[PDB]
Design an enzyme around this catalytic site. Structure first.
Site, PDB file in Angstrom:
ATOM      1  N   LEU A  15     -41.025  20.013  -2.117  1.00  0.00           N
ATOM      2  CA  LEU A  15     -41.730  20.101  -3.389  1.00  0.00           C
ATOM      3  C   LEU A  15     -42.834  19.044  -3.423  1.00  0.00           C
ATOM      4  O   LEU A  15     -43.907  19.271  -3.996  1.00  0.00           O
ATOM      5  CB  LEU A  15     -40.759  19.889  -4.542  1.00  0.00           C
ATOM      6  CG  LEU A  15     -39.576  20.851  -4.595  1.00  0.00           C
ATOM      7  CD1 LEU A  15     -38.503  20.315  -5.509  1.00  0.00           C
ATOM      8  CD2 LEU A  15     -40.028  22.219  -5.045  1.00  0.00           C
ATOM      9  N   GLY A  16     -42.548  17.892  -2.808  1.00  0.00           N
ATOM     10  CA  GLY A  16     -43.501  16.790  -2.689  1.00  0.00           C
ATOM     11  C   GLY A  16     -43.175  15.845  -1.542  1.00  0.00           C
ATOM     12  O   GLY A  16     -42.106  15.923  -0.946  1.00  0.00           O
ATOM     13  N   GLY A  19     -41.056   9.056   1.392  1.00  0.00           N
ATOM     14  CA  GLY A  19     -40.146  10.104   1.828  1.00  0.00           C
ATOM     15  C   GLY A  19     -40.614  11.456   1.338  1.00  0.00           C
ATOM     16  O   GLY A  19     -41.807  11.677   1.163  1.00  0.00           O
ATOM     17  N   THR A  20     -39.667  12.361   1.129  1.00  0.00           N
ATOM     18  CA  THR A  20     -39.958  13.670   0.569  1.00  0.00           C
ATOM     19  C   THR A  20     -38.967  13.999  -0.530  1.00  0.00           C
ATOM     20  O   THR A  20     -37.938  13.354  -0.675  1.00  0.00           O
ATOM     21  CB  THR A  20     -39.856  14.799   1.617  1.00  0.00           C
ATOM     22  OG1 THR A  20     -38.498  14.937   2.046  1.00  0.00           O
ATOM     23  CG2 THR A  20     -40.771  14.532   2.817  1.00  0.00           C
ATOM     24  N   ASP A 125     -42.860   2.808 -15.285  1.00  0.00           N
ATOM     25  CA  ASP A 125     -43.696   3.802 -14.594  1.00  0.00           C
ATOM     26  C   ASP A 125     -43.769   5.083 -15.428  1.00  0.00           C
ATOM     27  O   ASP A 125     -43.722   6.187 -14.938  1.00  0.00           O
ATOM     28  CB  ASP A 125     -43.151   4.014 -13.158  1.00  0.00           C
ATOM     29  CG  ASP A 125     -44.148   4.716 -12.235  1.00  0.00           C
ATOM     30  OD1 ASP A 125     -45.336   4.867 -12.608  1.00  0.00           O
ATOM     31  OD2 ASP A 125     -43.706   5.143 -11.150  1.00  0.00           O
TER      32      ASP A 125
HETATM   33  C1  LIG Z   1     -43.576  21.936  -7.062  1.00  0.00           C
HETATM   34  O1  LIG Z   1     -43.156  21.780  -8.430  1.00  0.00           O
HETATM   35  C2  LIG Z   1     -42.048  21.067  -8.781  1.00  0.00           C
HETATM   36  C3  LIG Z   1     -41.058  21.652  -9.570  1.00  0.00           C
HETATM   37  C4  LIG Z   1     -39.931  20.914  -9.951  1.00  0.00           C
HETATM   38  C5  LIG Z   1     -39.818  19.585  -9.537  1.00  0.00           C
HETATM   39  N1  LIG Z   1     -38.729  18.763  -9.877  1.00  0.00           N
HETATM   40  C6  LIG Z   1     -38.359  17.400  -9.632  1.00  0.00           C
HETATM   41  N2  LIG Z   1     -39.085  16.516  -8.881  1.00  0.00           N
HETATM   42  C7  LIG Z   1     -38.691  15.199  -8.685  1.00  0.00           C
HETATM   43  C8  LIG Z   1     -39.565  14.326  -7.855  1.00  0.00           C
HETATM   44  C9  LIG Z   1     -39.059  13.230  -7.171  1.00  0.00           C
HETATM   45  C10 LIG Z   1     -39.889  12.429  -6.414  1.00  0.00           C
HETATM   46  C11 LIG Z   1     -41.229  12.712  -6.340  1.00  0.00           C
HETATM   47  C12 LIG Z   1     -41.728  13.798  -7.027  1.00  0.00           C
HETATM   48  C13 LIG Z   1     -43.149  14.084  -6.915  1.00  0.00           C
HETATM   49  O2  LIG Z   1     -43.629  14.097  -5.792  1.00  0.00           O
HETATM   50  N3  LIG Z   1     -43.855  14.361  -8.094  1.00  0.00           N
HETATM   51  C14 LIG Z   1     -45.221  14.661  -8.186  1.00  0.00           C
HETATM   52  C15 LIG Z   1     -45.833  14.393  -9.408  1.00  0.00           C
HETATM   53  C16 LIG Z   1     -47.172  14.648  -9.585  1.00  0.00           C
HETATM   54  C17 LIG Z   1     -47.931  15.175  -8.543  1.00  0.00           C
HETATM   55  C18 LIG Z   1     -49.377  15.426  -8.758  1.00  0.00           C
HETATM   56  O3  LIG Z   1     -49.960  14.946  -9.727  1.00  0.00           O
HETATM   57  O4  LIG Z   1     -50.082  16.170  -7.843  1.00  0.00           O
HETATM   58  C19 LIG Z   1     -47.339  15.447  -7.302  1.00  0.00           C
HETATM   59  C20 LIG Z   1     -45.982  15.195  -7.125  1.00  0.00           C
HETATM   60  C21 LIG Z   1     -40.912  14.605  -7.793  1.00  0.00           C
HETATM   61  C22 LIG Z   1     -37.535  14.726  -9.263  1.00  0.00           C
HETATM   62  N4  LIG Z   1     -36.829  15.594  -9.967  1.00  0.00           N
HETATM   63  C23 LIG Z   1     -35.711  15.391 -10.631  1.00  0.00           C
HETATM   64  C24 LIG Z   1     -35.373  16.561 -11.254  1.00  0.00           C
HETATM   65  N5  LIG Z   1     -36.306  17.486 -10.980  1.00  0.00           N
HETATM   66  C25 LIG Z   1     -37.201  16.879 -10.175  1.00  0.00           C
HETATM   67  C26 LIG Z   1     -40.834  19.046  -8.744  1.00  0.00           C
HETATM   68  C27 LIG Z   1     -41.948  19.750  -8.371  1.00  0.00           C
HETATM   69  O5  LIG Z   1     -42.953  19.218  -7.572  1.00  0.00           O
HETATM   70  C28 LIG Z   1     -43.205  17.870  -7.184  1.00  0.00           C
END
Ligand SMILES: COc1ccc(Nc2nc(-c3cccc(C(=O)Nc4ccc(C(=O)O)cc4)c3)cn3ccnc23)cc1OC
Ligand SMILES: [Cl-]
Ligand SMILES: [Cl-]
Ligand SMILES: [Cl-]
Ligand SMILES: [Cl-]
Ligand SMILES: [Cl-]
EC number: 2.7.10.2
Length: 268
Positions: A15-16, A19-20, A125
């Site tokens: 998803l991101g 790490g990942t 944050d």
């Molecule tokens: C692809 O769409 C997503 C849908 C659901 C999620 N859900 C979740 N993501 C995370 C999580 C943890 C660590 C990092 C990230 C993360 O990379 N977030 C992020 C935030 C913003 C951007 C951006 O602005 O482009 C890109 C990435 C997200 C934690 N979580 C805890 C419960 N649910 C989630 C994440 C998605 O993408 C990053």
């Protein structure tokens, strides 16, 4: 807390990307739970355990729930999935989300932050990218990697080493004195409001952290997002009170948001 790797199933797609993060499922006895799993590549491990320790203590509808940690091919933090993901990204791709709906979501975050304030934790944050959507009408706060439990005798956390910091979300006292309190989080919340009403636009666009500091020190604040209601922009500006003493806490901010949201609801 410590989970069974045999009970975790991970998908290939990330998803991101520290790490990942990947989507997976974790088996209970009769159901599976959909999860988001943060996966590391010493410093990193320590931060993860610290983050898990904070999340473990939190129990609120507007805060992401930790399922636990797992130590296999790498270190993993496993959380209840918020399926729609970060608010900033959601709003960028969904520009016809209604004003009433944005108010609903930022209020939910305010209720999460009031709980965090009552719990004497500092988030450190709080940005739109760290607000995750369960549905279009249900936000939760995530990303407790910089969060700190306040000492019983102090109303702030004193950082020592200026780490890699989200300066554009930080209050003057954070930048100038390295002091982090729940009222600092209120400042960040004002920025998060601005981002939400700007549909996931980045704050202080084009500006270096240094120019932000100069701007804020001049008394200048960001302008009102298009279509953002008077009452909400006033509340942003109150969040950005330069003097911590005169800046409201989350009890105050949540109530103002609550009351307004009910007015907007009563209209209709
Ligand atoms: C692809 O769409 C997503 C849908 C659901 C999620 N859900 C979740 N993501 C995370 C999580 C943890 C660590 C990092 C990230 C993360 O990379 N977030 C992020 C935030 C913003 C951007 C951006 O602005 O482009 C890109 C990435 C997200 C934690 N979580 C805890 C419960 N649910 C989630 C994440 C998605 O993408 C990053
Ligand atoms: Cl697997
Ligand atoms: Cl099963
Ligand atoms: Cl720090
Ligand atoms: Cl920044
Ligand atoms: Cl309510």
């Amino acid at each position: 807390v410590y989970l069974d790797r045999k009970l975790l199933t991970l998908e290939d797609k990330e998803l991101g990307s520290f790490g990942t993060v990947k989507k997976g499922y974790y088996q209970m006895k009769k159901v599976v739970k959909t999860v988001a799993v943060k996966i590391l590549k010493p410093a990193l491990k320590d931060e993860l355990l610290a983050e898990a320790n904070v999340m473990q203590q939190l129990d609120n509808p507007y805060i992401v729930r930790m399922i636990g940690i797992c130590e296999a091919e790498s270190w993993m933090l496993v959380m209840e999935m918020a399926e729609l993901g970060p608010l900033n990204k959601y709003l960028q791709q969904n520009r016809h989300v209604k004003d009433k709906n944005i108010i609903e979501l930022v209020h939910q975050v305010s209720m999460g932050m009031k709980y965090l304030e009552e719990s004497n934790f500092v988030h450190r944050d709080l940005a739109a990218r760290n607000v995750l959507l369960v549905t279009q009408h249900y936000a939760k706060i995530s990303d407790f990697g910089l969060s700190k439990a306040l000492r019983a005798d102090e109303n702030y956390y004193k950082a020592q080493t200026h780490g890699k910091w989200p300066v554009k979300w930080y209050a003057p006292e954070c930048i100038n004195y390295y002091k982090f309190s729940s009222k600092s989080d209120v400042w960040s919340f004002g920025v998060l409001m601005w981002e939400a009403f700007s549909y996931g636009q980045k704050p202080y666009r084009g500006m270096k952290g240094s120019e932000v500091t100069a701007m804020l020190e001049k008394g200048e604040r960001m302008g009102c997002p298009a279509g953002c209601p008077r009452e909400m922009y006033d509340l942003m500006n109150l969040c950005w009170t330069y003097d911590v003493e005169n800046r409201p806490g989350f009890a105050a901010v949540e109530l103002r948001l609550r009351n307004y949201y009910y007015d907007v609801v009563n209209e209709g």
